[PDB]
């Protein structure tokens, strides 16, 4: 095609993310009259999310997914998006990104500093905790060998609840759980399904600890080369895909418990009051490290009413 573009992701072919990217790719191809074809590179084929972001910066990958929180690697105050229990719901995540001074500035910096254009934002689920033993309360977390992604905020969740974190790449998690090299992981229900973690985890606990969004990103190197009518095709497609993406996750969150129970998983509902209280010193560390910019991001987010 005139533009043979590539979209990389960590998720596999059964996932919501892949389904939404498929929808995006199909719309772009049809609405561009065949001038743009987007090929998909799932399962971290091109590297992890960090690697794929760098490929957008340098222009060698055209599209990828990222979370708003992941930009904490560049702007430490952006950790606010994944401080456990701070962001209440997706309503708050949307307004945090698009409707605060902090979020608008973050979008500008992504463009200027990191060479990527934000096309759209989706909901990507609320993270829960699976394990090889029941989590009936915060006590059961003590010493749990809990896989986390390579991200400070997930490491902190594990630390502050009393668990023993093992960072590792998403692609490695299934085997780590199967071999009992680790005792559990934490991810939204959709990923528990897509990656088949339920096959190798007998327990799921509704910790509700971190709210994930997902950003449709394009490389500025690619976006600048598209004539403006094709830019609009891409943008419009990303906005339509993100709405679909959000719907997949919302519907799954109401449907997946009966799926997991049918697959033999036991679901627990630990009291979250001590989970939340355990984070208080982490918040104070965040404010100590990030100073007035973090204080300010936190105040802007905490000001957002969670009710639509
Ligand atoms: O490895 C995981 O469990 C994963 O959920 C995979 C997902 O594709 C990715 O977007 C996130 C992200 O890297 C973290 O949430 C930190 O921002 O991590």
Curated annotation (Swiss-Prot):
Its main location: periplasm. Gene3D superfamilies: Bacterial extracellular solute-binding protein, family 7 (3.40.190.170). Keywords: Periplasm, Signal, Sugar transport, Transport. N-acetyl-beta-neuraminate binds at residues 10, 49, 67, 127, 147, 187. One of its GO terms (biological process) is transmembrane transport. InterPro entries: DctP_fam, TRAP_DctP, TRAP_DctP_sf. The keyword Transport applies. It comes from the Bacteria. Part of the tripartite ATP-independent periplasmic (TRAP) transport system SiaPT involved in the uptake of sialic acid (N-acetyl-beta-neuraminate). This protein specifically binds sialic acid with high affinity. N-Acetylneuraminate (sialic acid) can then be incorporated into the lipooligosaccharides (LOS) as a terminal non-reducing sugar, protecting the bacterium from complement-mediated killing by normal human serum. NCBIfam families: dctP, TRAP_S1. Belongs to the bacterial solute-binding protein 7 family. Is essential for lipopolysaccharide (LPS) sialylation and serum resistance. PANTHER family: PTHR33376, SIALIC ACID-BINDING PERIPLASMIC PROTEIN SIAP. This is Sialic acid-binding periplasmic protein SiaP. It comes from Haemophilus influenzae (strain ATCC 51907 / DSM 11121 / KW20 / Rd).
């Amino acid at each position: 095609a005139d533009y043979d573009l590539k979209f990389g992701m960590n998720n596999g072919t059964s996932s919501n993310e892949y389904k939404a990217a498929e929808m995006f790719a199909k719309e772009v191809k049809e609405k561009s009259q065949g001038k743009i074809e987007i090929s998909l590179y799932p399962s971290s084929q091109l590297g992890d999310d960090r690697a794929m972001l760098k490929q957008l910066k340098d222009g060698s990958l055209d599209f990828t997914f990222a979370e708003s929180a992941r930009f904490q690697l560049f702007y430490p105050e952006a950790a606010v998006f994944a401080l456990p229990y701070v962001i209440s719901n997706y309503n708050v995540a949307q307004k945090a990104l698009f409707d605060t001074e902090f979020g608008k500035d973050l979008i500008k910096k992504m463009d200027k500093d990191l060479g990527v254009t934000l096309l759209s934002q989706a909901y990507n689920g609320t993270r829960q905790t699976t394990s090889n033993r029941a989590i009936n309360s915060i006590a059961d977390m003590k010493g749990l060998k809990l896989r986390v992604p390579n991200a400070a905020t997930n490491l902190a969740y594990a630390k502050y609840v009393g668990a023993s974190p093992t960072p590792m790449a998403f692609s490695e998690v299934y085997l780590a759980l199967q071999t009992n090299a680790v005792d559990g992981q934490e991810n939204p229900l959709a990923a528990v399904q897509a990656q088949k973690f339920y096959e190798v985890q007998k327990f799921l606990a509704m910790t509700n600890h971190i709210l994930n969004d997902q950003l449709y990103l394009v490389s500025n190197e690619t976006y600048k080369e598209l004539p403006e009518d094709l830019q609009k095709v891409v943008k419009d497609a990303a906005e339509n895909a993100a709405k679909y993406h959000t719907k997949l996750f919302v519907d799954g969150e109401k449907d997946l418990v009966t799926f997991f129970e049918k697959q033999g998983v036991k679901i627990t509902h630990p009291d979250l009051v001590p989970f939340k209280e355990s984070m208080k010193p982490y918040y104070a560390e965040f404010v100590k490290q990030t100073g007035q910019k973090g204080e300010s991001a936190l105040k802007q987010i905490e000001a957002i009413n969670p009710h639509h």
